[PDB]
């Protein structure tokens, strides 16, 4: 009815609207626009805001959309490469009192509508009101904190909403390094006993790894049904609220790390007829979890599990069923009047898949099946059955037909596929370029030849330097995309710089270095120099750093000269230091700074330090620190093997410091006249094994509790 091409025209057409009329945004870029629409349509005659050509109306910059009234439809829009100036990108309200009812947002894309600051939280879709629908939308590349889709519950007008959220595509969500990266949140703790009655169904969660809670259910009466979770880190958690129905969901973990399933807390939960495959998560992130709760819990803790059922689920090739998880002096109430019946557990990666943290007498176990090779400590309710798992018609590892029929599961088949969800006009393209997937480029010896070669390289490229040759930098060597810098086998080239940082990983960058020699003879006379650094600003794209067969010498022109220094506000999916040699360094090897707001922030997910020698380093090799009390979130995972530290950390101090690491493995490593190893084991169960280490002329391991396992610790 009304085609508009500028904000002025838009605001005129929506100043007065009647049932049936539509406002069309003409194709093109809509930059820095705050779209507001109020009106009252009709069941047969909605008020529609639509794109001229779905995929060709690009809302960008500092933009958002807020609407209120009745029977509004919003379709075909794209929000790409911007950030909302409010708290919400698409909002089903226009003020605290004016909400949308019986309205719909469909066939719409939000693509990287992320703040440049990774620590700032917003909501991408905020649902208010009653009887709203959110369907067939694509939400991709959320790089900051916050919830992608939230159902709000802060007033009566938004409770008992019966919203429907369905057929949406939730694309990859990088690990945040902090709390609050849920994909779907239904309610909040402050209104958690209130009823929402939301249905989320037929959605596809694709590597939505923001945090441990993929779906944070925080209100009563919801149905989370018939969704697909593909290699998703974290769980579907019934965090607060009762009378949740969780059925027909398929978790395709594929043996990826930290892949969890369904966590029951609180009352009258039904978790049945779900399918799980290849889930590796443990404890609060296990494939199936039933928590202990706090008697007379405050609304923000954990209600004891009562009147709940966990039945007729299929759990294949998964590792952890955790009953009573969280049990302690506070969470002292074990599950009661609940049942665990008719489940099929077929896995061989963990032959003792159950952990019981408390008395499970309050749970009636009946009719379950567990593969011959595995055992349960529960005396009743389980029958052993052979491990028979065959890929079926729809490409899914399935139990035998006779067991399926015995529990009335039906076919093992996805309730929805990747191809049936999201906007119909927007591709689902990978956004990450792999190391060495591009061209090999020669870098001749000399001054700023590496600088120039990087400036024109592309993601995936490999810069190959001349063996034994000299390289000098007088400018920053900036890495704007995944790149490899290396020499083929033979004599290491030597790299020097007159700048305070040799190489900086910029936002979007990631770096492999192999068979290089970095030396400090040309470095400037400043404190805080480093060989490799991050960008110096918040980087809302996680980076990666791989260092293999590298030699680093004479970082001593001034104090605090580090090998690698990540500034506050950056996050590394993986840092690997392999088979490398470091000598005469006044700083730390790895300086992993943090921007402390949430005390739970951490700056690296996976750290591997293996095959190295560290000699005459005044500061530590690495401090890995996560504060706060979140037992539930990830921790860094750290592996330290086959290294030698000679005169490290003596410039009282420590040579390595690990604090709030959820998984720490140290082995085959010798300290020689170094500061001691320092540990701090946080509440929960941080897994910590230290085997075959020699502490020659080194003080005793510094720890807070004896809570770790240790074997073969020699003190010379
Ligand atoms: O804030 C801490 C959170 O871990 C918790 O309250 C909510 C949650 O996600 C959990 O316990 O796992």
φ/ψ (deg, to 5) at 158: -105, -10
SS3 category, 590: strand
- Show the tokens assigned to 494: 């030597």
Distance 401 CA to ligand 1 centre (A): 39
Distance 176 CA to ligand 1 centre (A): 15
- Residue 179 in contact with ligand 1 by CB distance below 6 A: yes
**Residue pair 633/607 in contact by the 8 Å Cβ criterion:** no
- Residue 589 in contact with ligand 1 by CB distance below 6 A: no
Distance 595 CA to ligand 1 centre (A): 21
Of all atoms in ligand 1, which is nearest to the CA of residue 216?
A: 9
Residues 6 or more apart whose CB falls under 8 angstroms from that of 175 comprise 181, 209, 210, 211, 233, 542, 571, 573, 605, 634
Please choose, from the candidates 383, 331, 338, the residue with its C-alpha nearest in 3D space to the C-alpha of residue 360: 338
Of all atoms in ligand 1, which is nearest to the CA of residue 629?
A: 2
Distance 179 CA to ligand 1 centre (A): 8
Considering only CA atoms, which residue is closest to atom 7 of ligand 1?
239
- Residue 240 in contact with ligand 1 by CB distance below 6 A: no
- Residue 504 in contact with ligand 1 by CB distance below 6 A: no
d(CA 194, CA 178): 28
**Residue pair 250/414 in contact by the 8 Å Cβ criterion:** yes
| Residue 251, burial from CB neighbour count under 10 angstroms (0-12, 13-18, 19+) | buried
- Show the tokens assigned to 271: 């978790």
Distance 395 CA to ligand 1 centre (A): 35
Considering only CA atoms, which residue is closest to atom 10 of ligand 1?
632
d(CA 123, CA 110): 11
Considering only CA atoms, which residue is closest to atom 12 of ligand 1?
632
Report, in this order, helix, strand and coil percent for the chain, each rounded to 5.
5, 45, 50
**Residue pair 261/202 in contact by the 8 Å Cβ criterion:** no
d(CA 128, CA 149): 11
- Residue 83 in contact with ligand 1 by CB distance below 6 A: no
- Show the tokens assigned to 26: 């003409």
Question: Which of 121, 211, 212 is the pocket-test mutation for ligand 1 (most atoms within 8 Å of CB)?
Answer: 212
Question: CA dihedral defined by 43, 46, 50, 52, rounded to 10 degrees?
Answer: 110
d(CA 217, CA 7): 38
SS3 category, 584: strand
Angle among Cα 342, 347, 353 to the nearest 5 degrees reads 80
- Residue 632 in contact with ligand 1 by CB distance below 6 A: yes
d(CA 499, CA 532): 11
- Residue 213 in contact with ligand 1 by CB distance below 6 A: yes
| Residue 624, burial from CB neighbour count under 10 angstroms (0-12, 13-18, 19+) | buried
Which resolution, in Å, applies to this structure? 2.0
CA 233 to chain centre: 6
Q: For the chain, how far is it from start to end, CA to CA, in angstroms?
A: 85
SS3 category, 582: strand
Distance 237 CA to ligand 1 centre (A): 10
**Residue pair 142/125 in contact by the 8 Å Cβ criterion:** no
- Show the tokens assigned to 77: 């829009």
The residue behind tokens 């349960």 is: 376
Question: CA dihedral defined by 147, 153, 154, 159, rounded to 10 degrees?
Answer: 160
d(CA 576, CA 611): 11
d(CA 29, CA 31): 6
430: Cα within 13 Å, side-chain hemisphere: 3
Angle among Cα 287, 195, 164 to the nearest 5 degrees reads 70
Distance 173 CA to ligand 1 centre (A): 19
- Show the tokens assigned to 709: 């396992």
């Amino acid at each position: 009815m009304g085609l508009v091409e500028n904000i002025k025209q838009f605001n005129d057409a929506v100043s007065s609207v009647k049932p049936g009329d539509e406002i069309v945004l003409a194709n093109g870029s809509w930059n820095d626009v705050e779209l507001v629409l109020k009106g009252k349509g009709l069941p047969d005659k909605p008020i529609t805001l639509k794109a001229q050509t779905p995929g060709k109306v690009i809302i960008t910059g500092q933009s958002n959309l807020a609407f209120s009234g009745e029977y509004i439809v919003i379709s075909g829009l794209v929000f790409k490469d911007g950030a909302t100036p409010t708290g919400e990108v698409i909002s089903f309200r226009t003020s605290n009192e004016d909400v949308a009812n019986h309205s719909r947002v469909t066939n719409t894309v939000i693509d990287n509508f992320s703040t440049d600051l990774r620590q700032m939280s917003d909501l991408w879709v905020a649902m208010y009101g009653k009887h709203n629908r959110l369907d067939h939308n694509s939400l991709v590349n959320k790089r900051n904190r916050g919830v992608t889709v939230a159902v709000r519950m802060n007033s009566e007008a938004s409770r008992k909403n019966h919203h429907i959220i369905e057929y949406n595509y939730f694309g990859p969500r990088q690990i945040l390094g902090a709390n609050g990266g849920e994909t779907l949140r239904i309610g909040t703790s402050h209104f958690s006993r209130e009823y929402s009655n939301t249905t989320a169904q037929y959605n596809y969660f694709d590597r939505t790894n923001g945090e441990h809670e993929i779906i944070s259910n925080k209100s009563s009466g919801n149905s989370l049904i018939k969704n697909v979770f593909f290699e998703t880190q974290g769980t579907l958690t019934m965090r607060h609220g009762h009378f949740t129905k969780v059925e027909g969901n398929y978790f395709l973990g594929n043996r990826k790390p930290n892949t969890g399933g369904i966590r029951i807390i609180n009352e009258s939960q039904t978790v049945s007829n779900n399918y799980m495959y290849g889930l590796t998560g443990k404890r609060l992130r296990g494939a199936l979890v039933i928590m202990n709760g706090v008697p007379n819990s405050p609304p923000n803790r954990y209600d004891p599990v009562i009147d709940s059922a966990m039945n007729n689920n299929i759990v294949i090739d998964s590792d952890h069923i955790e009953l009573g998880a969280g049990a302690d002096a506070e969470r002292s109430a074990a599950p009661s009047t609940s049942e665990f019946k008719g489940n099929i557990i077929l896995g061989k990666s963990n032959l003792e898949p159950f952990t019981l943290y408390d008395d499970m007498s309050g749970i009636n176990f009946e009719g379950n099946y567990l593969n011959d090779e595995a055992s349960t400590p529960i005396k009743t309710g389980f029958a052993s059955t052979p491990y028979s798992v065959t890929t079926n018609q729809y490409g899914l590892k399935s139990p035998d037909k006779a067991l399926l029929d015995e529990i009335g599961f039906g076919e093992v088949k996805l309730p929805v596929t990747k191809e049936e969800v999201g906007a119909d006009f927007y591709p689902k393209n990978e956004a990450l370029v792999a190391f060495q997937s591009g061209k090999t480029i020669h870098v001749k010896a000399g001054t700023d030849t590496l600088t120039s070669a990087l400036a024109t390289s592309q993601g995936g490229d490999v810069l190959v330097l001349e063996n034994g040759a000299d390289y000098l930098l007088t400018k920053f060597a900036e890495v704007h995309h995944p790149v490899t810098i290396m020499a083929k086998a033979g004599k290491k080239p030597v790299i020097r710089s007159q700048k305070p940082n040799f190489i900086n990983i910029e936002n979007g960058g990631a770096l492999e270095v192999e068979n290089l020699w970095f030396d400090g003879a040309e470095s400037p006379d400043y404190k805080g120099n480093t060989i490799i650094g991050t960008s110096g600003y918040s980087m809302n794209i996680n980076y990666n750093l791989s260092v293999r067969n590298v030699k680093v010498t004479d970082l001593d022109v001034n104090g605090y000269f580090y090998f690698f220094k990540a500034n506050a506000g950056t996050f590394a999916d993986s840092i690997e230091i392999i088979d490398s040699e470091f000598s005469n360094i006044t700083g730390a090897i790895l300086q992993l700074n943090r921007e402390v707001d949430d005390l739970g922030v951490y700056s690296v997910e996976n750290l591997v330090i293996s095959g190295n020698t560290f000699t005459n380093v005044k500061e530590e090799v690495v401090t890995v620190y996560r504060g706060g009390t979140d037992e539930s979130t990830f921790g860094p995972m750290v592996s330290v093997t086959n290294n030698t530290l000679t005169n490290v950390g003596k410039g009282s101090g420590a040579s390595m410091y690990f604090h709030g690491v959820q998984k720490l493995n140290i082995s085959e490593t010798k300290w020689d006249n170094s500061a001691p190893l320092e540990l701090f084991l946080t509440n929960g169960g941080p897994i910590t094994v230290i085997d075959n280490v020699e502490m020659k002329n080194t003080d005793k391991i510094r720890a807070n509790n004896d809570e770790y396992e240790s074997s073969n610790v020699t003190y010379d």
